């Protein structure tokens, strides 16, 4: 039931796989190469989320403890705190952002079961990852698109799990940077620049923003009041776009790739409970249930049961 914690190397060597300026067309050879290079990272995320979801079913404290054993093993090896090797882009940094998010979400969900040593080990590691991922964004040449918002997932989950007001403020700034970037017509310009993937990337940018706001409810706060309505305009564009892509087609200059909502689209499971117009999200909700390790696991269940199971 609990496989051995897998190796948590300090180092990452991921491979970018888009061929065009708009990062909208995939080179399948490079995608296959990247998949193999980052398999340990994706496997770690998938398993800690699987264990957290199993813990959330109840009567399975062993599953929660399994997630903590895996997290503690990576914390003790200094996983991801070494070299972010750069081959053709910053894919290694993006992988550290997403994997920190998965790890921090799993810790947030399972930490009630942590030993004293596991809390110290894991929290120290998650704070070191927060600082390292934040520092990446100090260079203004790193464009603060959806990768920046995704960085906020791990920072926010670490902030809540450690009750760190400084990290909570940092995460709030990242969330608000995304909200502030929404234009009156609902677009996020850096995601609209992704041609046939413009809808996909508006969905993918919405995901971490919603998840951050949902984690803020764990501290009693309602982040949807910040620039209230702006996130709704973006979310409504996404839902509309799955029905009729004509606005994304015109504004992006490309016919959108045909796709069903999946995985991280499960932000809708939370957001439909917050929106003033919930029923407009029914068609996206019907594509569920939604699971994404980078968001903590089963979004459909967490929206009903809460992100953190209670003991």
Q: How far is the CB of 16 from Cl ion (least distance, A)?
A: 13
Cα 103 from Cα 161, distance rounded (Å) = 12
Q: How far is the CB of 88 from Cl ion (least distance, A)?
A: 11
Helices (H), 137-225: 146-162, 165-181, 189-192, 198-217
Cβ proximity of 153 and 295 under 8 Å: yes
Sole residue written with tokens 């969330």: 175
Q: How far is the CB of 90 from Cl ion (least distance, A)?
A: 13
DSSP secondary structure string, 170-189?
HHHHHHHHHHHH--TTS--H
Q: Which is nearer to Cl ion, 85 or 112 (CB)?
A: 85
Cα 215 from Cα 210, distance rounded (Å) = 9
Q: Which is nearer to Cl ion, 37 or 104 (CB)?
A: 37
Q: How far is the CB of 83 from Cl ion (least distance, A)?
A: 8
Cα 140 from Cα 297, distance rounded (Å) = 32
CA atoms within 13 A on the CB side of 207: 31
Q: Which is nearer to Cl ion, 14 or 156 (CB)?
A: 14
Q: How far is the CB of 89 from Cl ion (least distance, A)?
A: 13
Q: Which residue is nearest to Cl ion (CB)?
A: 85
The three-class DSSP label of residue 283 is helix
Residues that bind Cl ion (CB under 5 A): 85
Q: Which is nearer to Cl ion, 12 or 108 (CB)?
A: 12
Q: How far is the CB of 86 from Cl ion (least distance, A)?
A: 7
Which residues are within 8 A (CB) of 74 and not within 5 positions of it... i.e. 6 or more apart? 5, 8, 44, 80, 103, 125
The DSSP letter of residue 265 is G
Q: Which is nearer to Cl ion, 43 or 85 (CB)?
A: 85
Q: Which is nearer to Cl ion, 13 or 280 (CB)?
A: 13
Buried b (16+ CB within 10 A) or exposed e, 119-142: bebbbebbbbbbebbbebbeeeee
Extract the tokens encoding 296.
């903590």
Q: How far is the CB of 85 from Cl ion (least distance, A)?
A: 4
CA atoms within 13 A on the CB side of 36: 5
Q: Which is nearer to Cl ion, 84 or 239 (CB)?
A: 84
Q: Which is nearer to Cl ion, 2 or 85 (CB)?
A: 85
Q: How far is the CB of 31 from Cl ion (least distance, A)?
A: 18
The DSSP letter of residue 164 is -
């Amino acid at each position: 039931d609990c496989p051995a914690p897998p190796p948590g190397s300090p180092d990452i060597r991921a491979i970018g796989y888009y061929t065009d300026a708009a990062r909208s067309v995939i080179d399948p050879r490079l995608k296959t190469q990247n998949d193999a290079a980052v398999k340990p990272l994706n496997a770690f995320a998938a398993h800690v989320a699987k264990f957290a979801d199993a813990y959330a079913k109840g009567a399975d404290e062993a599953a929660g403890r399994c997630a903590l054993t895996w997290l503690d093993a990576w914390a003790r090896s200094g996983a991801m705190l070494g070299r972010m090797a750069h081959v053709n882009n910053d894919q290694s940094d993006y992988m550290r952002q997403w994997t920190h998010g998965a790890a921090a979400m799993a810790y947030l969900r399972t930490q009630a079961l942590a030993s004293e040593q596991q809390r110290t080990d894991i929290e120290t590691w998650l704070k070191r990852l927060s600082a390292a991922n934040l520092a990446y964004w100090d260079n203004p040449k790193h464009k603060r698109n959806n990768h920046y918002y995704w960085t906020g997932v791990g920072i926010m989950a670490t902030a809540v799990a450690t009750r760190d007001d400084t990290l909570l403020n940092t995460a709030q700034g990242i969330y608000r940077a995304g909200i502030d970037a929404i234009e009156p017509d609902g677009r996020l310009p850096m995601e609209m620049a992704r041609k046939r993937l413009a809808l996909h990337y508006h969905d993918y940018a919405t995901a971490p923003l919603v998840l951050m706001a949902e984690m803020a409810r764990l501290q009693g706060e309602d982040w949807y009041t910040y620039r209230q309505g702006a996130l709704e305009r973006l979310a409504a564009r996404v839902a509309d776009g799955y029905r009729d892509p004509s606005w994304f087609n015109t504004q992006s200059g490309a016919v959108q790739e045909t796709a069903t909502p999946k995985a991280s689209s499960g932000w809708v499971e939370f957001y439909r409970l917050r929106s003033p117009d919930p029923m407009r999200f029914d068609a996206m909700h019907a594509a569920g249930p939604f699971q994404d390790p980078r968001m903590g696991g089963n979004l459909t269940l967490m929206a009903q049961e809460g992100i953190v199971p209670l003991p």
